[PDB]
Amino acid sequence: TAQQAPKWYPSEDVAAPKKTRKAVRPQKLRASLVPGTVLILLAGRFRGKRVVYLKHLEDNTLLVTGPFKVNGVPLRRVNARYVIATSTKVSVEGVNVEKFNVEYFAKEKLTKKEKKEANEIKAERVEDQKVVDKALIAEIKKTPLLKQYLSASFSLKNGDKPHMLKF
Amino acid sequence: VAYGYPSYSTIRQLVYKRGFGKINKQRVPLSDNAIIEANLGKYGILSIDDLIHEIITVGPHFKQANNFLWPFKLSNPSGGWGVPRKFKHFIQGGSFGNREEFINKLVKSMN
Amino acid sequence: ASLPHPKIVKKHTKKFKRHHSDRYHRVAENWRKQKGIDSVVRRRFRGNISQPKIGYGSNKKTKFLSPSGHKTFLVANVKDLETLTMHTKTYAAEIAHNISAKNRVVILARAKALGIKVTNPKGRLAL
Amino acid sequence: VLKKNPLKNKQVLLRLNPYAKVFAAEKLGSKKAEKTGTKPAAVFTETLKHD
Amino acid sequence: GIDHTSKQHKRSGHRTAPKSDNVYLKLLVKLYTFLARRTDAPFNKVVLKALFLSKINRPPVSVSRIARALKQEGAANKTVVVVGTVTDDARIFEFPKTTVAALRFTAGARAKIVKAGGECITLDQLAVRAPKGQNTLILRGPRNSREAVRHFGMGPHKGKAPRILSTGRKFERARGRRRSKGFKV
RNA sequence: ACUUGGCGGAAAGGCCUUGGGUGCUUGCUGGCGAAUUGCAAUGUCAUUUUGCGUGGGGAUAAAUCAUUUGUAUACGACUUAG
RNA sequence: GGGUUGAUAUGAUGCCCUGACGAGUAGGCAGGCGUGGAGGUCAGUGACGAAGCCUAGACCGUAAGGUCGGGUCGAACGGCC
RNA sequence: AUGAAGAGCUUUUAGUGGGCCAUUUUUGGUAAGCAGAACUGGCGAUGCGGGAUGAACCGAACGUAGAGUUAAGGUGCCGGA
RNA sequence: GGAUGCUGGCAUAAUGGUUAUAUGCCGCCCGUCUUGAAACACGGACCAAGGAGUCUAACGUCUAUGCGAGUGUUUGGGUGUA
RNA sequence: GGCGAGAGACCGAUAGCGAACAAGUACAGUGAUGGAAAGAUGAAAAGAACUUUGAAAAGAGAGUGAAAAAGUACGUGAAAUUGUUGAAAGGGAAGGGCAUUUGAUCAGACAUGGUGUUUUGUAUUUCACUGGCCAGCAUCAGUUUUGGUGGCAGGAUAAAUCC
Ligand SMILES: [Mg+2]
Ligand SMILES: [Mg+2]
Ligand SMILES: [Mg+2]
Ligand SMILES: [Mg+2]
Ligand SMILES: [Mg+2]
Ligand SMILES: [Mg+2]
Ligand SMILES: [Mg+2]
Ligand SMILES: [Mg+2]
Ligand SMILES: [Mg+2]
Ligand SMILES: [Mg+2]
Ligand SMILES: [Mg+2]
Ligand SMILES: [Mg+2]
Ligand SMILES: [Mg+2]
Ligand SMILES: [Mg+2]
Ligand SMILES: [Mg+2]
Ligand SMILES: [Mg+2]
Ligand SMILES: [Mg+2]
Ligand SMILES: [Mg+2]
Ligand SMILES: [Mg+2]
Ligand SMILES: [Mg+2]
Ligand SMILES: [Mg+2]
Ligand SMILES: [Mg+2]
Ligand SMILES: [Mg+2]
Ligand SMILES: [Mg+2]
Ligand SMILES: [Mg+2]
Ligand SMILES: [Mg+2]
Ligand SMILES: [Mg+2]
Ligand SMILES: [Mg+2]
Ligand SMILES: [Mg+2]
Ligand SMILES: [Mg+2]
Ligand SMILES: [Mg+2]
Ligand SMILES: [Mg+2]
Ligand SMILES: [Mg+2]
Ligand SMILES: [Mg+2]
Ligand SMILES: [Mg+2]
Ligand SMILES: [Mg+2]
Ligand SMILES: [Mg+2]
Ligand SMILES: [Mg+2]
């Protein structure tokens, strides 16, 4: 024999985890995030774009829209820690947002075999966008320069001090 | 050493945050009144509060309670010592000696 | 397939090398304690090499485990391998260095049949 | 296996002391005192203000 | 750091796990540490400690010593326990009907105790007959009777047997032992 | 991007100006588009040099060794000549 | 300082719980690593390549050191008590 | 009164038997980084932060790591503030 | 009386290891006598191999074993697979 | 000691007798005396016929051999030390430690049991996922840091201000 043996072998039966005491209870969003509030996106494809907050979803996310006709941001799901909530406010009374949920955004995950060589849209989502944005632009048209404020993009300038700024 | 006259607040905070008993020559965190009832129930003491009482209202069994209490292991003061130089008397601008009622502030910073 | 284990921690992945194994060829790299009266390494002056001590010891839960999570067991034949039949999730076989190529085939076939992991299934393979 | 500190963790606070529940109910950390109409004598004040 | 009052990491100073590699003694230890752990009897702890002892701390116990011990009051029907060996003694001519528990018996001791109508017993049979030490009587033998102890504490005015191979006249009976030759110690 | 006329030598290598051409203009009002980077991943936008290619111009040497000299010289070097 | 022989499985010098502690020349003690040979065993490895040598190639160990892969080599050699 | 970290007891044996520094007390000496004593604490045998640099001074004594707070000493730049 | 849930990307040298290099800070030559060594104190140019508390007679303390008021077969004899 | 035998927990060519070999040899010293170093091709010389360059030694080929990485400088063929190639760095040394970058190089896990037959070789399989590396969010726990804010007490029941 090259190596003799261990006289005792450890058990291969796996031990079970103790009962944990970490219950899931909901988020306490900060007081500056109210539906209708205008947000600035800080990360992602649409970083620097101003957008409208509509609904707090179940997976600690915010439902969000450009509206798409204004700046090009569709009905989307974002995270609260990657946005700045401004003081500017819109009224969302008149938008039937109850339809949207975590299942509305499902990726239909990709398989192992499908490797992209070098490099589509759902009509339901397109039409729901056209339904919501028409009710939103009707209220954005009231306050002046707001359609422009949303079509524009946010940027920090020389001298901007975010600890001093107000959004 | 630095010494002085402690208040109920700092006695209570010490015994509740850094509260350790000498059970069979071991440093046991108190964490419950059963330990105290088992090791001091002889001397009428049942709770961490009755212990604090025997401490502050210096009783017949202060010796036994204070010996049961393991020496308090305090950190350094979170805001500092207040002086630039420690090893003069509190009177001469240092830290040692009797700081009669200013010991509560230091101990709370250290606990 | 390995048994679940924690993250493996080492605390010193660098080999403890003898003082002046870089300076003299006669001085080998195998650790020797400096026993000198004026040794900076023995006295532990700032900026010197580290000395091995028991605080660098590895956790007893993750000791002797390879990164796969198996403990290595040397084997020279199928009978030595079969001791790990009911211990596949804990122990992995290492074929000894002095084993011939034609017997390595047998050991690897039996290990594949019994589900035993082999750390060196490439020694003495021709193609 | 772990020392939880009272003065936070109200649960351990109440495990150690059951009086902590009614202490907060009555706000005994903010007890008001009965007003009194006592005034010091003239000798105290004149000795204090003396040179 | 700590200003230490005691010596750190000091062994108790007491033997555990007898360093004899005798498996039967190890089995007796396995039994008696269990009994000391679960019986609440001091006898088990005494016997367990005694089983750890060295040979010179396990001196032989004479049957005449056992007879003395049984000539006590209320000790005639007791069980004598010797953690060690029992030796014979021809200086006695009567021996009672006692039972004796011991590790080892010499042939003469066994024969005397049996011929007197008694029985010779092991410490494992003692465990089933008396798990808490019922009606027992532990006997230890003499320790300072040894030869080495004669020389322990050698010095002036102690009277403590110098270490010497050949005895007689002209071996350490001169200057330092009589006033005629210098001084007496 | 062209074009006119100036000024600038401390390291100017930049500053100003003329004329028209061309593009954009968020000064104002509108229309269309963006989505799928899937809840973030710098999410790639700069300048530094070099090389290989195409196509459009431009110009057609010297130094060293060797020989020689002695205003030089340990040797190199230096100074000369051919 | 303590707990734990209960049948069924493996190690009671075992496993587990609890608390404290950790500087070190001369020096002491303990547990281990490695070398030549001896008894035993693995019905151990081996010309389908032993031992040795080289290897900013890999793994284990706090370390002593051990293991593997590749190259070279050619006849013996190791693990455990 | 306070504390006890277990109290007491024995056997055997190693190294050592050149010392040095600081505060204070003090002898000789003009004095000495001189010679010699007393008490303690240290270096020797001891790394660490500070005193630019230093065996002994200040602070603090060391298993391997993480986070926080500080000692002495510092916060124009070298240099953390 | 000790962290669980949801989600995404990658599933490979990407994290990580090793190694060389660069950068910031630290880092005096080992061994040795010595109160004190980096020393303007001594040995050491380099490499391989060899190289230094052993055995014995008599003892001591301790430990283990065997027998035990006894103990020690082995000077010798008998026998032997010598 | 001599002759003849048998053994070894002995040494294994810097060991073991000084001497495993043409060793008390070569050699030194007037002399008495002193006194080494030095073993291993391969199973077998089959020890390289022959061509070619060269004055030749040799080389390059060819050939023998299981192997010329065995060629009488011959088993294996370490290190110091050196040559060539490749890689990298380098302003009065080099080397080391902690940490990361950059370059080079490298191990490990990526099957898993599993609904399941959209199945071929008809029972092999048809198979969506499974577990590793790196992160983000929420809700908690332990240790801590930095802020905002509320209710109370005390003192000459602040002193003052104000009347
Ligand atoms: Mg601070
Ligand atoms: Mg300070
Ligand atoms: Mg070296
Ligand atoms: Mg020293
Ligand atoms: Mg704990
Ligand atoms: Mg410590
Ligand atoms: Mg124990
Ligand atoms: Mg030592
Ligand atoms: Mg080989
Ligand atoms: Mg190398
Ligand atoms: Mg051969
Ligand atoms: Mg002595
Ligand atoms: Mg002496
Ligand atoms: Mg010394
Ligand atoms: Mg010190
Ligand atoms: Mg001081
Ligand atoms: Mg820190
Ligand atoms: Mg600074
Ligand atoms: Mg890498
Ligand atoms: Mg990396
Ligand atoms: Mg790297
Ligand atoms: Mg390097
Ligand atoms: Mg330096
Ligand atoms: Mg000197
Ligand atoms: Mg000098
Ligand atoms: Mg000299
Ligand atoms: Mg000398
Ligand atoms: Mg020299
Ligand atoms: Mg050697
Ligand atoms: Mg006799
Ligand atoms: Mg005889
Ligand atoms: Mg060969
Ligand atoms: Mg060869
Ligand atoms: Mg050769
Ligand atoms: Mg070399
Ligand atoms: Mg928290
Ligand atoms: Mg907080
Ligand atoms: Mg008030």
Q: Which chain B residues are within 8 Å of D5, Cβ to Cβ?
A: 16-17
Strand F within 7 A of A114 CB: no
Q: How far is the alpha carbon of A8 from chain C, nearest alpha carbon, in Å?
A: 11
The answer to whether the beta carbons of residues C21 and C28 sit under 8 Å apart is yes
How far in angstroms lies nucleotide H11's C1' from the CA of residue E139?
24
Q: Number of residue pairs across A and C with CB atoms under 8 Å?
A: 25
From the list D5, D15, D17, the residue facing B17 with the nearest CB is D5
Cis peptide before E162 (omega within 30 of 0): no
Q: How many angstroms separate the alpha carbon of residue C98 from the centre of ligand 11?
A: 19
SS3 category, A84: strand
Query: Could you tell me the two tokens for E128?
Result: 């089933």
Q: CB–CB of D19 and B13 under 8 A?
A: no
Nearest CA among A64, A39, A46, A44 for reference residue A149? A39
The answer to whether the beta carbons of residues E46 and E126 sit under 8 Å apart is no
Strand J within 7 A of C11 CB: no
DSSP string, A90-133: ---TT--GGG--TTTS------SS---S-----HHHHHHHHHHH
Angle, helix B33-40 to helix B48-56, in steps of 10 degrees: 60
Integer angstrom CA distances of residue B4 from A140, B100, E35 = 68, 4, 54
Q: What resolution, expressed in A, was reported for this entry?
A: 2.6
The answer to whether the beta carbons of residues A41 and A76 sit under 8 Å apart is no
Residue type, C77: N
Contacting residues 18-47/D vs strand J (CB within 7 A)? 27, 29-33, 35-40, 45
Which chain B residue has the Cα nearest residue D8? B17
User: What are the CB-based long-range contacts (under 8 Å, 24+) for B73-82?
Assistant: B73/B18, B73/B20, B74/B18, B74/B107, B74/B110, B74/B111, B75/B110, B75/B111, B76/B110, B77/B106, B77/B109, B77/B110, B78/B109, B78/B110, B79/B109, B81/B106, B82/B106
Taking the C-alpha atoms of residue E172 and residue E166, their distance in angstroms, rounded to an integer, is: 10
Query: Could you tell me the two tokens for B109?
Result: 């910073």
Taking the C-alpha atoms of residue A2 and residue C99, their distance in angstroms, rounded to an integer, is: 10
Nearest CA among A135, A155, A146 for reference residue A54? A135
E118: left (phi over 0), alpha (psi -120 to 50) or beta: beta
How far in angstroms lies nucleotide H12's C1' from the CA of residue E154?
14
SS3 category, C15: coil
The answer to whether the beta carbons of residues E171 and E164 sit under 8 Å apart is yes
Taking the C-alpha atoms of residue A44 and residue A81, their distance in angstroms, rounded to an integer, is: 12
Mutate: best of B49, B51, B75, B111, partner D, most D CBs <10 A: B49
Chains A and C touch each other (3 or more Cβ pairs < 8 A): yes
Q: Which residues of A145-160 are buried (b: 16+ CB within 10 A; e: fewer)?
A: ebbebbeeeeeeeeee
The answer to whether the beta carbons of residues E108 and E88 sit under 8 Å apart is yes
Strand F within 7 A of A68 CB: yes
Chain centroid, CA B31 distance in Å: 16
DSSP string, A54-80: EEE-SSSEEEEE--TTTTS--SEEEEG
Integer angstrom CA distances of residue E121 from B74, D2, E135, E136 = 61, 53, 15, 13
Q: How far is the alpha carbon of C42 from chain A, nearest alpha carbon, in Å?
A: 37
End-to-end CA distance of chain A: give it in Å, rounded: 76
Method of elucidation: cryo-EM
Nearest CA among C53, C87, C52 for reference residue C69? C87
Touching check for D17 and chain B: CB below 8 Å?
yes
